[PDB]
Structures are given as structure tokens and as C-alpha cells.
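Thread: potassium ion complex, take 2
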Amino acid sequence: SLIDMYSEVLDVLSDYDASYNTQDHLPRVVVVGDQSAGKTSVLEMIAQARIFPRGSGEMMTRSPVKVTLSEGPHHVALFKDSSREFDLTKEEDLAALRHEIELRMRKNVKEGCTVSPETISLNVKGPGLQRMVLVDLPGVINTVTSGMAPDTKETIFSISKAYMQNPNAIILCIQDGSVDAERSIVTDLVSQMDPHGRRTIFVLTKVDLAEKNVASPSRIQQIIEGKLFPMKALGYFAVVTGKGNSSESIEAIREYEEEFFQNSKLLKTSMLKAHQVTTRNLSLAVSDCFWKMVRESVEQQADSFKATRFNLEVREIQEKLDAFIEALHQ
Amino acid sequence: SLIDMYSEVLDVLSDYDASYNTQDHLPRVVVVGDQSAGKTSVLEMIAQARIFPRGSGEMMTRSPVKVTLSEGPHHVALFKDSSREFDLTKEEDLAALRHEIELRMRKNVKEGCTVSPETISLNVKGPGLQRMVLVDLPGVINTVTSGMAPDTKETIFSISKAYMQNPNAIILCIQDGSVDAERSIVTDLVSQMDPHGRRTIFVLTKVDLAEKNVASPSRIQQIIEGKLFPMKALGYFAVVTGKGNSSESIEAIREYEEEFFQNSKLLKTSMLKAHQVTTRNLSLAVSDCFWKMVRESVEQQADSFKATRFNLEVREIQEKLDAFIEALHQ
Ligand SMILES: Nc1nc2c(ncn2[C@@H]2O[C@H](COP(=O)(O)OP(=O)(O)O)[C@@H](O)[C@H]2O)c(=O)[nH]1
Ligand SMILES: Nc1nc2c(ncn2[C@@H]2O[C@H](COP(=O)(O)OP(=O)(O)O)[C@@H](O)[C@H]2O)c(=O)[nH]1
Ligand code: BEF
Ligand code: BEF
Ligand SMILES: [K+]
Ligand SMILES: [K+]
Ligand SMILES: [Mg+2]
Ligand SMILES: [Mg+2]
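Output below.
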């Protein structure tokens, strides 16, 4: 419940005063990537539910979506400051929840705008879920298409920058394996925010399409070894997080990914490695990295609180953080 | 043979003095688009031969390739200033020609460079070929990958600008239908060079992949009607110019495209139109547009020659152009 404590420190910290005495440098896992690279698909394989706007060919995530993942006895979801439990095993609840999320996303987008920086906050609890706080972000673009507000590209870059810029955020850089590395839009921003790769994890999606279309299966190995993209990362993972145009289920997608990798030239040849491979493996590394960064960040931000009290002399913000750092040490 | 006359005016005009008294404003069809959008694939369906470096996932066209297409009794290809006929019906000739083109492309790229502006010139003659002069260009990129020279992205933009900037060039804007319109790299340059769409033709490739993956088949109609991409064009065509990772044959690809479109929801519903559809249709429009622009350009460039002779007072350049404008009027 300490993930529960953490998240309440997070969403009472916002609020968002935003100043010298109150910086928000607490770890979140921030999911960035070109439009349709599969950011939301990765999120849904980790949350294990089909609940968010998702689809190929167009802009689907039009505002940030903050998901706190915690352990629980039933797969459930609740909005922030709400008591309604959506039962993620019931299709009627899933369908209702998809509608409720789309409606809030549409509500956030003001009249002459295409995208919003207003967050949608949701808790997902479930048996065996990794504990973590993620933020799914709008896909970065290069071309503003007809109907969109003219500023949309720069607004989307601005929303991604706002979250990657937090020095203790984990940057989960989602990279479409089915599209030439040279076509990538997000690489430059990722490289600016974390030049040395101290808090970035790299995810290559759609490797099944890569085999089904690409003329150099060694370039996949070159990517996963950090040798192709001009950026650094703590780790590199290859992943299969969907198939086709129609929404499948999480279990169908997980089966498909397992089949693909166990039949893939890349693993049987040991071109790339087994620990580098499924979303499950990515999940574990991301959770480890998130918790390590939380344990290395809270005190120094305890520290900040301490500095604030007197240096000058942040009220109940400091004591929620103090309760959490209390629990945190076993 | 007047296409033959034209081409010799072209490649004796280069040379390339490049000045006030000698601008090169003669029509060429200039094939531009993001890396792997399928520029070379379109060229090969029009030339009807598998001879050029081509493939998904990486940079394949590393220098401009000028192809003059003319009518002939046998499908043949010759390099500029060469007598060797490659018989495009013989696989040994095709294979040799692929090797010879790759070798010249590699020869053009200087030691610390990735791409070259040095052209490779080739004549392809054949029964029923459209008559035309095309220039296949390197794919525009957004991210310089490891191993490439650092300037490569700007050099590639510079090579494309050099050719689109000719005020009488037809810009053949090749646009990958399998990747979100918002991800497009080349749209902005196309919009700069021909803002009003007076000399641009728009080609949407990979519509088969679009059906096999994309979540809005109405967006294809919106693209072909000029209503999605922030650019203007004289016309819009949807096209299928390959399939998979292994090189098929031109005839296999043409069969595949015919099958796909005749079984496609888009044509049977008449979402988009039949004249808007195959590469063959694109071919005819591009040839018509090229010849119209030649007939509307040569005299005014006859005009230029005339101006040069005395205004001041370009030697045998003017008389080849004069011979061609002579023939040109039946
Ligand atoms: N074949 C294949 N398709 C995928 C994979 N991952 C995602 N997709 C598809 O890509 C589409 C766009 O994904 P989405 O999650 O909305 O991307 P986002 O905009 O980056 O959040 C989804 O509808 C999936 O169908 C994969 O590993 N393989
Ligand atoms: N499925 C499908 N694949 C295509 C189509 N057009 C091209 N391709 C594939 O896309 C790959 C990259 O094409 P290429 O012509 O080298 O692109 P270029 O870099 O833009 O010149 C080719 O190897 C083809 O296999 C199409 O209409 N459908
Ligand atoms: F539409 Be995605 F999430 F970029
Ligand atoms: F490699 Be391509 F011709 F852009
Ligand atoms: K998407
Ligand atoms: K290519
Ligand atoms: Mg998304
Ligand atoms: Mg090419």
C-alpha cells in the first residue's frame, strides 16, 4: 500500500503550485513515442486491461493518462477521487470504462484545441500487477493534419517535455520496430532530455511486422544493442503488443507475442537475448528501475521539504512524504 | 524519339554551368518521399523492371537516379554514354544491371559521406512504356542513425530541394499509406516548394497494409480527396507497389495490386474512384502532366536562349533545344 501512499503524495502534490520552494521531482514512468508507435498498447499489456483509446493510423491519446498500478485481489479500476470500482473481468464494466475515459479525454480538450495537458488519473489494481505510476502521453508528430489546431505539434512536444524534464522520471521510449529508424520523430527529444541514458528505457514494438516486411533482421539486433539510434538507455527490449486493426484481448496478444518470439529467428539463433524480450521482462525492469529511483529520490526531496521549513520559514505535503519514506524502509 | 531528343538536351545541359544566363528549368518528374515510402517501387512499376536498390527498413537510394523512359521494341536499359544494352527479359542481364547500379551508387558516395548528389543516368526503353524523364531521390529522414555522416539529413533535404525547386519540375510526392499521416516528414518541404499545388502529384502507397492495420478506412478517402495532408496537388492516386520483404516480380506485384483493389471495400463502395487507383492510372496522369509542362516550358526557355544571344552577346545547347521544339510541334 506503499504504492498507494506514494500515489496520494503524488496527486495531493498537484495542486501543482510550481515554484522554487515546491518542485515536483518524484519518479513517474513516462511513456513517450511517435504517434501509433504503441505507447498505449505497452501500457495495456502492463495494466492487463483493454480500457484506453488505442488504434493505428491516427491520434488516439489526446491528454496525459496517469495510471497507478498496484497489487490487489481482484482486477479493478477506479478513477481518482471516486468510489466506483470497474470490474475488469466483466465486459459490461470494461465497455462502460472505455466510454468514461474517452468522455473525460474529450472533455479536457478545450474548444479550439486538439490536445490537452489536463491529466486523467486512474488506479488499476490486480493480482500480480507490477506496482508503479505511469503516464501515457500523446504521440509526438511531425505533420499537423487538417482539422487539428495549428499549434498541436508544438503542444504535444510541450506535454512530453514537461514530463520527461522531471530529473527523476523514467523515460519509457516506445519505438515502432515496423518503421525505419531514420523516420523516428521522438529520438531527438529523448536524447535532449536524458543525453547520457541514466533514466531511459528503450522499447521496440511491432517486431512481428519487422520480420514480416524488413530487409535486414540484423538491424533489429543492432537496435537492441544500442548501436543504431542516436540515444542512450539503461536497457533495450523488443516487444509484441498487438496485431492487426481490430482490438484483440490481452490474453490473445500475450499468446501471439510468446508464439512469435519462440518461433523467431532472432531468439533461436540467439541474435538477441531472452531477457531482452517480452513485455513481461520489460515490465519487471521498469518496476525495478522505478522503485530504485523512488528510494533514491524521496529523501532528497524530504531534503527539499526540510530546506523549505526554515531556510525561509508545503504543509501537509511534507508529512505525507514523511509517512511514505517512513513506510518505505520496510 | 523526341523523348530521346529531350533527354539529350537534358544531359548535354549538364555540364551544369549554373548561372544567370543558364538556368535549368526544364521539366523532370522528381520522385520524393520519406525513406521507404516506396519512391523506387513506384519507379520500378512504371519502368517495369526490378533493377534499382530497393527495400524496407533502411536507406536504399543514396544518390539521384535519372531514368529516361521511352518507347521501344524490346525491354532494354542502357547507361548514359554507353552502348551496352541490358536485356530486361533475361535474368542474367537483370542481375548484372542491379550490380552495376549498386556499384555506381557506392562509387558516387565520397569517403566521409553517406549520400551523394552525383546522378546515375539510365535509359529504359520498352514496348508500351510511358515516355518521361524521372529522377528517383534519396528518402527524406528525421533521425541520423549510427554510421551515417552527421550532415546526412540536411544533405538529403538539400538534394530533394535542388530538384523540387526547378519551377517546371513535376513533384511526385510518394506518401506511405501504412504510416499515420501525422508522422510524414516530406509534407512540409512539398508544401514549401509548390504551395499552390500547380506541379505536384500525390501518391499514396501501401494501401493494402493500410487496410490490414488501420482503424479508419474513411481517412484513406479523406487523403485522396486532398482533405487530410496540409498540401495541394493536381491529383491524388492510391497505389500498391509491392508486398512483403522479398523482392517479387513486376508482374506478381501488378497482379497483387489488381486483386487488392478489385476486392477492396474502397472501390466497391466507391469510397474512392476507379480513375484514382492503380499505378497505371498514376502513370498516365504523370506522363500527360510531364508533356504538358514540356510544351509549356521549352519555348520560354527557347526564350531564355534568345535573350542570352544578344541582350548581352549557351552555344550548341540552344540548337539542340531548337531541334527539339522543332520536332515537338508534330
Ligand atoms: N502487429 C503489431 N501491432 C501492434 C503492436 N503493438 C501495437 N500494435 C498496433 O498499433 C496500434 C496503435 O497503437 P496505440 O497503442 O494506439 O499507439 P500509441 O498512439 O503510440 O499509444 C494498435 O491499435 C495496435 O493494434 C505489435 O507489437 N505488433
Ligand atoms: N505491402 C506493400 N509493400 C510495399 C508497397 N510499395 C512498396 N512496398 C515495400 O516497401 C519497401 C521499401 O520500398 P522502396 O521502393 O525501397 O522505398 P523508397 O526508399 O521510398 O524508394 C519495398 O521493398 C517494398 O517491398 C505496397 O504498395 N504495399
Ligand atoms: F495515439 Be498515440 F497514443 F500516439
Ligand atoms: F530508401 Be528510399 F529510396 F528512401
Ligand atoms: K495511435
Ligand atoms: K527504402
Ligand atoms: Mg496512446
Ligand atoms: Mg528509392
